[PDB]
Design a binder for this molecule. Structure first.
Ligand SMILES: *[C@@H]1O[C@H](CO)[C@@H](O)[C@H](O)[C@H]1NC(C)=O
Ligand SMILES: [Cl-]
Ligand SMILES: [Cl-]
Ligand SMILES: [Cl-]
Ligand SMILES: [Cl-]
Ligand SMILES: [Cu+2]
Length: 235
């Protein structure tokens, strides 16, 4: 159970984005229905009045929270992967438009899930803004909590993988458009019951054998990380 408070750009807090530049849902409940339009940008997908200005090569940091800013972030039970996608705003996230900029599942060295490291990072994970065409974009941050993903939601609606999905309105101003955005996947549509990483047993299957849902990270992606960039507590 987690939500996006706002974003930082190059380590500078852009301020509370809820219902302003984040298409916030009313609460931190998960999405579970893989076929639902809610898979696109969660249960209240509508244009919000601001879009955060960034340039290609900027660090865009999502900041997540549980109940209040910089709290426990997400229950430590919620082991799973984190991904960030991008699509042009003109799409409203419809069609084969979502391009993957970031994937993190299990780190074998530290023996930690992406979610474990997100808590340690005070809810902060980042992507570097790619050299796409200047214009308006949606950045879709996705946390998958796997603590009930031994079942499929489609088969048993009180279990299944849990999706924490947040769409940020991002305006890319300065960019040479040297890596134009390639073809995307649909949400809903890319994740199905057979997709690797949707149905998984974190209790019996070694985390080392976990494979995150495709698609793969775009070669044009400029980097990203799960790591605190800024101290919320100093504001
Ligand atoms: C899953 O989503 C589809 C598409 O919106 C909907 O028709 C179906 O009824 C949903 N499942 C449940 C249990 O609500
Ligand atoms: Cl603020
Ligand atoms: Cl749902
Ligand atoms: Cl679908
Ligand atoms: Cl980064
Ligand atoms: Cu939860």
């Amino acid at each position: 159970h987690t939500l996006v408070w706002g974003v930082w750009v190059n380590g500078v807090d852009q301020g509370d984005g809820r219902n302003i530049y984040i298409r916030s849902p009313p609460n931190n409940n998960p999405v579970k229905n893989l076929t639902s339009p809610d898979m696109t940008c969660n249960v209240d997908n509508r244009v919000v009045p601001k879009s955060v200005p960034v340039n290609a090569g900027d660090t865009l940091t999502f900041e997540w929270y549980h109940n209040t800013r910089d709290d426990d972030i997400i229950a430590s039970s919620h082991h799973g992967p984190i991904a960030v996608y991008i699509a042009p705003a003109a799409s409203n996230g419809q069609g084969n438009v979502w391009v993957k900029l970031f994937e993190d599942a299990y780190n074998v060295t530290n023996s930690t899930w992406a979610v474990d490291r997100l808590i340690t990072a005070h809810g902060q994970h980042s992507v570097v803004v790619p050299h796409v065409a200047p214009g308006d974009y949606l950045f879709r941050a996705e946390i998958i909590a796997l603590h009930e993903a031994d079942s499929l939601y489609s088969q048993n609606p009180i279990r299944g993988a849990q999706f924490y999905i947040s769409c940020a309105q991002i305006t890319i101003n300065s960019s040479d458009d040297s890596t134009p955005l390639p073809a995307g996947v649909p949400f809903p549509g890319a994740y199905t019951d057979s997709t690797p990483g949707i149905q998984f047993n974190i209790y019996t299957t070694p985390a080392t054998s976990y494979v995150a849902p495709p698609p793969s990270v775009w070669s044009g992606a400029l980097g990203g990380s799960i790591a605190q960039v800024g101290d919320a507590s100093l504001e």
